[PDB]
Swiss-Prot record:
Transmembrane segments: none
Complex and partners: Monomer and homodimer. Interacts with EPB41L3 (via FERM domain); the interaction is direct and inhibits the protein-arginine N-methyltransferase activity of PRMT3. Interacts with the 40S ribosomal protein RPS2. Interacts with ALDH1A1; the interaction is direct, inhibits ALDH1A1 aldehyde dehydrogenase activity and is independent of the methyltransferase activity of PRMT3.
Lineage: Eukaryota, Metazoa, Chordata, Craniata, Vertebrata
Gene behind this protein: Prmt3
Zinc finger intervals, C2H2-type: 16-39
Record's protein name: Protein arginine N-methyltransferase 3
Swiss-Prot/TrEMBL domain comment: The C2H2-type zinc-finger is responsible for substrate specificity.
Similarity field: Belongs to the class I-like SAM-binding methyltransferase superfamily. Protein arginine N-methyltransferase family.
Tree of life domain: Eukaryota
Protein's job: Protein-arginine N-methyltransferase that catalyzes both the monomethylation and asymmetric dimethylation of the guanidino nitrogens of arginine residues in target proteins, and therefore falls into the group of type I methyltransferases. Catalyzes the asymmetric arginine dimethylation at multiple sites in the Arg/Gly-rich region of small ribosomal subunit protein uS5/RPS2. Also appears to methylate other ribosomal proteins. May regulate retinoic acid synthesis and signaling by inhibiting ALDH1A1 retinal dehydrogenase activity.
Outcome of gene disruption: shRNA-mediated knockdown leads to elevated osteoclast numbers and osteopenia.
Residue numbers of the full-length protein present here: 38 to 145 of 528
Location relative to the cell: Cytoplasm, Cytosol; Nucleus
Length: 121
């Protein structure tokens, strides 16, 4: 047995679990995309749908972490939302990447005339 390699070192890394499942992902983007492929669920749609504000978005995340509902439900929701609680604001998990994700980026100023003219065809 010439080959002799034994090591149990640790590398400081960050990982964020999934909302629906318990899958870890190096970064947030990874998860979101994963859900859009498997759970066929988009997080961006929510922010725009329930106009989740800076804090709102946070509640939406933790909400799934605590409640742990199903995609089907995610689509079938109404006001008051099941995440309209402060308690949710708190990070259900530790060093939650998703929570860090800049939701603002999602907000796009519809000022530029970019392809301005719906139903042009
Ligand atoms: Zn998942």
């Amino acid at each position: 047995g010439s080959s002799g390699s034994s090591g149990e070192p640790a590398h400081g890394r960050q990982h964020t679990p999934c909302l629906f499942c318990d899958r870890l992902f190096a970064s947030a983007e990874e998860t979101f995309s994963h859900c859009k492929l498997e759970h066929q669920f988009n997080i961006d749609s929510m922010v725009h749908k329930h106009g989740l504000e800076f804090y709102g978005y946070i509640k939406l995340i933790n909400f799934i972490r605590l409640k742990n509902p199903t995609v089907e439900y995610m689509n079938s929701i109404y006001n008051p939302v099941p995440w309209e609680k402060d308690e949710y604001l708190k990070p259900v998990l530790e060093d939650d990447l998703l929570l860090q994700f800049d939701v603002e980026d999602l907000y796009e100023p519809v000022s530029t005339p970019f392809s301005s003219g719906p139903s042009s065809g």
